[PDB]
A and B are shown apart, each in its own frame.
With several copies, the nearest count.
Chain A
Amino acid sequence: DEDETTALVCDNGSGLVKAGFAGDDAPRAVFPSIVGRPRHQGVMVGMGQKDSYVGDEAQSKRGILTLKYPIEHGIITNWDDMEKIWHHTFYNELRVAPEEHPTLLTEAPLNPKANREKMTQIMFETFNVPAMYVAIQAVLSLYASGRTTGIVLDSGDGVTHNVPIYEGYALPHAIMRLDLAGRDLTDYLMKILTERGYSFVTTAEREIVRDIKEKLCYVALDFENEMATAASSSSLEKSYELPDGQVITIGNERFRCPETLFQPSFIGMESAGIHETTYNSIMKCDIDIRKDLYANNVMSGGTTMYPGIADRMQKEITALAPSTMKIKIIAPPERKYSVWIGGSILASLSTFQQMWITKQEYDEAGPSIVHRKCF
């Protein structure tokens, strides 16, 4: 498949792992961070079957499987399951592996340090990677976006980081990390769809409601006006096809789920929302920085695919921001993929070739080396 020892890049979240090789502008394939296991007793023999299923296998045979996610809020809690997902990712589907390629991982600036230590150990001892680097997701978003400055809202599956970067430098005192992400938005949606008579509890059901959110939901520029009509008229409803031929018809729930980004109180979180959070990352920086961060609100990660997000965010920040000042938002089509893409850019940059931890330095220092060599 490949004729060069290019670095491999993997963006591993509580949703899916985007993966491919450096010096592409997209992952080659997406690998759901899922390990599936049968929840039923087998009766027939000569049926093939797996002890455990991963990624797309886990989703394809999900009718009788319970599906578990090894990553919680950016932390791998079950790395034995991640090794199976990674083995499949590398050797079966991407047809590349760390064994013959250096590997770049994507992470948040405040991701618990022990998590990088374990991923570092796995790629060096299980997959025999010749070298490693763990990069900041905000950096990767800025490279993909054509910027050196901005507030990056990396919208992960289990956590949003929110870190300001100026002239290529971190401004860590203004990080406003929030425990709200795409997976929590799904929880709100399933609770309100439960109120309508469509409970989502078991694995197949959990996957369906996630799929409903991704295809039907939006934020809109004005929640209250959108609701005044959506709560009053069937013209704002959409019927989603469930796997068995039945449908679910969804009204203002279509936007109330996404709205948790602006209203975290919807899921019990003590927060004013992502626009206030973005505002504080800008506002807590020095006034000669603020102008450049107001001009560079960078949306990245997932949930940014919701219609109206660019307008909802720019308008709320403008309202919070001082007058005269111009507030601008970056929301490129390289959305949801921009962290992976930035990983490709960074791994391949000539300026980054000396930033790699080799599998020399690794064994002399051990896995904790990532804490000194990467960030």
Chain B
Amino acid sequence: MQALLGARAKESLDLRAHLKQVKKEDTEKENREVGDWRKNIDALSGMEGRKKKFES
């Protein structure tokens, strides 16, 4: 009896997991190449005197 319902469930999960894998493949393939920068501030610390430019 249950062959048709089994096949229907199988095809449903197959298509869903298919779309899912189409996503997760290139998801995991590139998941560290997507980093960012540090954004540090100088805080005017590395100068031991007056600047050479006109602003100081």
Contact = CB atoms under 8 A, between A and B. Distances in A.
Interface of A: 21-26, 28, 46, 142-148, 334, 341, 344-345, 348-349
A24 B34 contact: yes
Interface in B14-36: 15-16, 18-20, 22-23, 25-27, 29-31, 33-34
A23 B29 contact: yes
Contacts of A22: 26
Interface residues of B, number: 15
A200 B20 CA distance: 37
Contact of B31 (A25, A46, A345): A25
A348 B22 CA distance: 9
Interface of B: 15-16, 18-20, 22-23, 25-27, 29-31, 33-34
Contacts, number: 43
The 8 closest A-B pairs by CB, nearest first: A24-B30, A25-B27, A146-B19, A23-B26, A348-B26, A146-B20, A26-B34, A345-B22
Contacts of A143: 19, 22-23
A347 to B, nearest CB: 9
A23 B23 contact: no
B54 to A, nearest CB: 11
Contacts of A21: 30
B20 A345 contact: no
Interface majority SS (helix, strand, loop, mixed), chain B: helix
A23 B22 contact: no
Contacts of A146: 16, 19-20, 23
Interface majority SS (helix, strand, loop, mixed), chain A: loop
6 contacts: A23-B26, A24-B29, A24-B34, A25-B27, A146-B20, A345-B22
B23 A148 contact: no
Contacts of A24: 26, 29-30, 33-34
Contacts of A148: 15, 19
Contacts of B30: 21, 23-26
A316 B22 CA distance: 31
Contact of A344 (B15, B16, B19, B26): B26
A257 B50 CA distance: 53
Contacts of B19: 142-143, 145-148
A354 B30 CA distance: 24
Nearest to A22: B26
Nearest to A334: B23
A344 B26 CA distance: 8
Contacts of A334: 23
Contacts of A349: 22
